[PDB]
Design a protein around this ligand. Structure first.
Ligand SMILES: [K+]
Ligand code: NI
Length: 172
C-alpha cells in the first residue's frame, strides 16, 4: 500500500535523524516490522529522493539538526530583507547554509550563513548590522542562491511555499 510505505519512509527518516549514533538495518527492520531487504530498498529510494543517508558498517547515518535534505534555492531581494528571509526559513523548519552571488571580479562568491534557529538568525543579523563592509546582496540586482537544508521533503516543500508567498523566489 502506497500509504503504508509513505508512513514507513517517514519513520525511517525520523529515527535516523533523532539518533546520535548509526542505526543498523537490522534494528530498523525490527523497529518497523519489515525484512532487512525492505529496508535496503527503502533507503536506496530515500537517497534517490535527496536524503543524505550513508550506510556505514555500524549502521545508517543521516545527520539530525535539520540537515536530512538539501537544496539550492534561487531568490531575489535587497540586503534589508535578509532577516525576513532567514526567519521565514528557520520558522518553517529549515536552515540556511550559505549564499552564492555573482561578482564582477571573482565570477561568484560563496559566503557562509549557517543559521537554523531564530536566535542564530538574530545573532547573524546583529553581527551583520554592526559590521562596516559593502553589502554583497547589492551585487547582481539582488539575485542570489542559498543552500537550504531541512529535516525532510515535506518541510522543504513548506519552506518553498512560504518563500513564494513572500515573493522571494525566482520562478520562470
Ligand atoms: K542523526
Ligand atoms: Ni537571501
Amino acid at each position: 500500500m502506497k500509504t503504508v510505505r509513505q508512513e514507513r519512509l517517514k519513520s525511517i527518516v525520523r529515527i535516523l535523524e533523532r539518533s546520535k549514533e548509526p542505526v543498523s538495518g537490522a534494528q530498523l527492520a525490527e523497529e518497523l516490522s519489515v525484512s532487512r531487504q525492505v529496508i535496503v530498498q527503502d533507503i536506496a529510494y530515500l537517497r534517490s529522493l535527496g536524503y543524505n543517508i550513508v550506510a556505514t558498517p555500524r549502521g545508517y547515518v543521516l545527520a539530525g539538526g535539520k540537515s536530512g535534505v538539501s537544496r539550492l534555492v534561487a531568490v531575489k531581494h535587497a540586503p534589508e530583507e535578509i532577516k525576513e528571509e532567514l526567519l521565514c526559513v528557520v520558522r518553517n523548519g529549515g536552515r540556511i547554509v550559505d549564499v552564492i552571488v555573482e561578482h564582477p571580479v571573482y565570477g561568484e562568491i560563496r559566503g557562509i550563513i549557517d543559521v537554523s534557529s531564530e536566535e542564530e538568525v538574530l545573532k547573524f543579523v546583529n553581527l551583520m548590522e554592526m559590521a562596516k563592509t559593502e553589502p554583497l546582496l547589492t551585487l547582481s540586482g539582488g539575485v542570489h542562491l542559498h543552500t537550504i537544508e531541512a529535516p525532510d521533503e515535506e518541510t522543504m516543500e513548506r519552506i518553498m511555499r512560504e518563500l513564494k508567498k513572500k515573493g522571494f523566489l525566482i520562478e520562470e
